[PDB]
């Protein structure tokens, strides 16, 4: 049960006398009992990586074998909690230490064993029933919004012997008892799951329902879904924080798990300060977002081995809340700073790199994490249906599209929102490329649009065609200079400029363009494309007749119709409403129809 | 109190580069400190990098020249490197290992502090929002700096990064609406005239009463540069979080530190990183850069301004690359602007400050700060993209407004950027010059400025 330290070099310890230790087991190193993980066996020597600082660890110190892998505790007390990569409560540590530091070997439990939770069992369960893994056997009222379903661990089954009456219990009180084969087993409100081990489901279903970000360029041209995998770049000022906060304030998610992997210490203080201040509107009332949010916090100076366990902690919390029947949306910021830790740990073990120093198993570890997202039919007796949507921020090492992390990621994800540096230099936000970005969900979303917004797909198609034709013409107008241009090219240019400046371009720091609902998006695009069609038809039919129509005698006639289009983005979906905005757009459509009928 | 006697081994079993290997050590502790006594009688100090069984691998701070394998005595301390710390350290000059070098006594300790630090709970920090008015338009106007930030100066060889550093140190204060900074200054591998420059500049402007210097010159041992930025950051942490003052830490040539890191990693036969630097250089620079900010309940702060020199003016080298992943922005000193007699030669297109958005605006500096900065940046970018093809294809094929961007280029590089090595501009003077430059364009070409701001500030 006790080995001894034999060598120490960096975060890697070598311990002798470790006979039956298993790989990836957890151990306690030294007199401070620092947690560590077995990453190599040889004879009866074991190689451990330590999740703390190893300064001052002598040769001969004890090493205690725990017998279990790296796990998380899952129970009531996760909504509103701030952890690190190992699920250590950063607020309980400060409250109990009364200090501004995190001690070494600090051993405090992730969920407080002191709070009394209001637990009511299920009505039809009773002594003698048959229960299996996944079944919901109680409900704890965690707060005003989130109801915490108490489930059975997925590897248990039996007949009920005792189940607790409604009341107030803490996470140490026994609530259920099962008998399988004459053996007995008691269950409390908390379970324990290994973070590197995926959680079972009944079935994985296809993703068919959108995930509204609020941005027009992403909701229209490059949609995400509930259960999708997305990759954005980590770029300051481009509009990434807008997305991170929009996922939380105004979306269709129930739970939000935000993971920071390698985080500038002054950019994590911002997140930790102004997340407890954000609010959202539910049933008229205004309620804090920290009632349905959990943060995993990891900065760039914490141990390297705790940097790579952050992603797993976050995705396991996500799966735990998915198995209740909720829709979770995880944000994993700086997947690149996670790959950096992978590379460093690989180097410390003297392994052969593959490309640019990275381990050869880089794609195999990114896939194992991205492929845990999806829409599922939850395991257990009540028919549920959950989903986890992962968004990963892959920062560039200068802006290369063939970084090993970026090229390994593009083989796995279904949506890619690209970064345009030329657009971020001209202060066009959000700086989405819209010519290299892609989404592979635009065919699974078809029967949703064909049922709710039945006229949107042609608008999207034509908008994309216009935006590509403009790019074709741009590097022609650059050299020659727009003298000899067909009138249809003039209309293409001057409608593409409208689409770029008034539809794709958005300002998240204003009280009307913070979250743009989808009826607003569809209405703006519909009016713009209707104008394009009308102008093109007018100029095309009277081509060889008398009084040749041109783009210049269109900007004369309808100069204020070209202003209600360039100002559709100022309507407000909370000062105005849905029917008011729809009426305005319909009136503008009739106006431009009358103008094009009169001029022609 | 460690009261047991110390153990002294005459059992050296190898000298190689900066490292000495010992056998028959009794329970070797990791990161321990060792005192070496050479045959003639001189004394050096080292730190244990790796223990394994009975072996210990010490790195000697002052080199391994003169050391043999039969008569050198290594005495083991039993403790990690704890430096003595006090408030009298202000006004004193030390060498790269903390010894007095100004004819003064050794530090009488108020405390002994571990030089690796102590991790600060991320929940006990405070977000920095107090702008520092450095008096430099290129920084104040477009790359503002909050009090508690970490923002380096990306420079090159032969460029005036010491002049910019000294001007910031001399002029830094808070934005005047109605004391001042202590300074800690570590120098890693500088020449004698750079140290002379900095000492003279500090003591000619009455500051020396409030400055602590740690100096490692280019004629000094190379392995000291590893502990130099950590004794300078352990004093700054005592002053700020125990004596409650506002500290400004300058770290000159964070490139020499990384070269010493590579030199120690290459002698240990480790799997190299990119360009030969150690594979753990990210986790190593992050334990230096992340010792900066404000904490809850204590009225002290630490601002950090490292100073790099990019090899071959390359910003994708490992050192600038990894430094950018850790610090909150960068100030970019350009060579093309230097060769045209511009001071300070700051290129604002790859410069950035990530804490600016929350330190400027109404009630902090002025309501038009962010829009003026954004429009100036966009105009400079468009003007560069014009000037490229203007020089390439056609001085007369330029449009009527493709000549306004070139006039903006000239007047912006000569009137906004170019400042003067002793000129202290307010923030509002910087903003007024920005408006005088933006008035070149008709108000229809300023798309990055709202109408409410254009109506109030453009017509003057």
């Amino acid at each position: 049960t006790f080995g001894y330290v034999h060598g120490v070099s960096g975060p890697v310890v070598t311990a002798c006398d470790m006979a039956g230790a298993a790989m990836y087991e957890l151990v306690r190193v030294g007199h401070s009992e620092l947690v560590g993980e077995i990453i190599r066996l040889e004879g009866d020597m074991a190689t451990i990586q330590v999740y703390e600082e190893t300064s001052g660890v002598s040769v001969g110190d004890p090493v205690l074998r725990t017998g279990k892998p790296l796990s998380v505790e899952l129970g009531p007390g996760i909504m509103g909690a701030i952890f690190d990569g190992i699920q250590r409560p950063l607020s309980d540590i400060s409250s109990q230490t009364q200090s501004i530091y995190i001690p070494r070997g600090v051993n405090v439990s992730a969920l407080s064993r002191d709070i009394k939770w209001d637990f009511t069992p299920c009505k039809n369960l009773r002594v003698g029933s048959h229960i299996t893994g996944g079944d919901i056997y109680g409900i704890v009222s965690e707060n005003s919004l989130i109801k915490h379903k108490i489930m059975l661990p997925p590897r248990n089954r039996g007949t009920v012997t005792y189940i607790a009456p409604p009341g107030n219990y803490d996470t140490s009180d026994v609530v259920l008892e099962l008998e399988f084969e004459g053996v007995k087993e008691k269950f409390t409100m908390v379970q324990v799951w290994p973070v590197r081990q995926v959680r079972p489901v009944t079935e994985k279903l296809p993703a068919n329902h959108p995930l509204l970000t609020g941005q027009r360029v992403l909701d229209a041209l490059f949609p995400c879904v509930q259960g999708g995998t997305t990759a954005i770049p980590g770029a300051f000022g481009c509009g990434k924080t807008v997305i991170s906060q929009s996922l939380s304030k105004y979306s269709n998610s129930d739970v939000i798990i935000y993971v920071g992997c390698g985080e500038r210490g002054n950019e994590m203080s911002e997140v930790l300060r102004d997340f407890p201040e954000l609010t959202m509107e539910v049933d008229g009332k205004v309620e804090s977002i920290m009632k349905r949010t959990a943060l995993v916090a990891n900065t760039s100076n914490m141990p390297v081995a705790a940097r790579e366990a952050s992603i797993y902690t976050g995705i396991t919390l996500s799966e735990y809340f998915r198995d209740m029947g909720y829709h979770v949306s995880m944000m994993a910021d700086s997947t690149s700073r996670w790959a950096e830790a992978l590379r460093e740990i690989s180097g410390r073990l003297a392994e052969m790199p593959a490309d640019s120093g990275y381990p050869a198993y880089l794609g195999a570890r990114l896939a194992s994490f991205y492929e845990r997202a999806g829409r599922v039919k939850c395991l257990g007796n009540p028919e549920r249906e959950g989903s986890v949507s992962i968004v990963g921020a892959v920062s560039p090492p200068g802006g290369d599209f063939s970084d090993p992390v970026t090229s390994a990621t593009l083989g796995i994800v279904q949506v890619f929102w690209g970064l345009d540096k030329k657009l971020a230099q001209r202060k066009h936000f959000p700086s989405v490329n819209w010519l290299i970005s892609y989404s592979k969900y635009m065919r699974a979303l078809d029967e949703y649009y064909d049922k709710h917004f039945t006229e949107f797909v042609p608008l999207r198609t034509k908008a994309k065609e216009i935006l590509q034709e403009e790019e074709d013409l741009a590097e022609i107008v650059q050299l020659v200079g727009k003298a000899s241009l067909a009138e249809t090219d003039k209309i293409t240019l001057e409608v593409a400029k409208l689409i770029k400046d008034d539809f794709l371009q958005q300002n998240g720091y204003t009280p009307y363009d913070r979250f743009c609902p989808f009826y607003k998006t569809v209405g703006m695009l519909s009016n713009m494309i209707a104008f394009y069609d009308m102008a093109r038809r007018a100029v095309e039919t009277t081509a060889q007749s008398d009084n040749k129509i041109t783009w210049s005698i269109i900007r004369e006639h309808m100069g204020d119709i070209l202003y209600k289009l360039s100002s559709m983005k100022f309507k407000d979906p909370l000062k105005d409403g849905e029917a008011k905005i729809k009426s305005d757009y319909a009136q503008l459509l009739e106006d431009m129809q009358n103008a094009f009928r009169s001029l022609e | 109190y460690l009261s047991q006697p110390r153990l002294t081994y005459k059992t050296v079993s190898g000298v190689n580069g900066p490292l000495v290997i010992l056998d028959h050590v009794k329970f070797p502790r990791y990161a321990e400190i060792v005192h070496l006594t050479l045959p003639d009688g001189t004394k050096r100090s080292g730190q244990v990098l790796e223990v394994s069984g009975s072996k210990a691998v010490v790195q000697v701070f002052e080199g391994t020249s003169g050391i043999d394998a039969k008569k050198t005595s290594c005495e083991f301390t039993g403790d990690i490197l704890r430096t003595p710390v006090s408030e009298d350290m202000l006004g004193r000059v030390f060498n790269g290992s903390g010894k007095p070098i100004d004819r003064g006594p050794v530090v009488l300790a108020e405390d002994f502090l571990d030089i690796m630090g102590q991790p600060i709970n991320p929940q006990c920090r405070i977000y920095p929002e107090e702008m520092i008015q450095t008096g430099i338009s290129a920084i104040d106007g477009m790359n503002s700096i909050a009090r508690g930030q970490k923002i380096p100066i990306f420079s090159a060889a032969g460029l005036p990064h010491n002049e910019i550093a000294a001007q910031i140190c001399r002029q830094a204060g808070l934005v005047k609406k109605s004391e001042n900074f202590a300074i800690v200054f570590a120098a890693m591998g500088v020449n004698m005239e750079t140290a002379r420059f900095f000492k003279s500049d500090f003591e000619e402007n009455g500051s020396m009463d409030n400055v602590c210097l740690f100096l490692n010159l280019a004629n000094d041992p190379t392995i000291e540069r590893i502990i130099t930025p950590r004794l300078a950051l352990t004093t700054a942490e005592f002053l700020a979080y125990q004596c409650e003052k506002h500290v400004l830490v300058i770290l000159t040539d964070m490139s020499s530190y990384a070269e010493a890191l590579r030199e120690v990693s290459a002698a240990r036969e480790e799997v190299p990183g990119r360009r030969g630097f150690p594979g753990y250089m990210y986790t190593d620079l992050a334990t230096i850069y992340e010792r900066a900010g404000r904490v809850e309940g204590r009225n002290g702060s630490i601002t950090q301004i490292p100073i790099l020199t990019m090899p071959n003016d390359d910003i994708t080298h490992p050192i600038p690359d990894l430094t950018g992943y850790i610090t909150e922005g960068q100030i970019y000193v350009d060579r093309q602007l230097h060769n045209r007699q511009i001071y300070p030669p700051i290129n604002v297109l790859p410069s950035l400050s990530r804490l600016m958005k929350s330190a400027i605006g109404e009630g902090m500096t002025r309501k038009d700060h962010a829009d003026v900065s954004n429009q100036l940046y966009a105009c400079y970018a468009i003007g560069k993209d014009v000037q490229a093809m203007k020089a390439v294809v056609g001085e007369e094929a330029l449009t009527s407004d493709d000549l306004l961007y070139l006039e903006f280029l000239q007047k912006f590089e000569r009137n906004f950027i170019a400042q003067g090595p002793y000129e202290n501009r307010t923030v509002f003077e910087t903003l007024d010059i920005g408006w005088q430059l933006l008035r070149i364009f008709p108000k229809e070409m300023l798309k990055r400025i709202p109408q409410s701001t254009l109506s109030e500030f453009y017509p003057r």
Partner: peptide, 18 residues
């Protein structure tokens, strides 16, 4: 290439002489 071949050579020297 040369650095990685050096690391491998040192590995296969250590393991054989030890």
């Amino acid at each position: 290439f040369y650095r990685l071949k050096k690391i491998q050579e040192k590995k296969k020297i250590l393991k054989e002489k030890s």
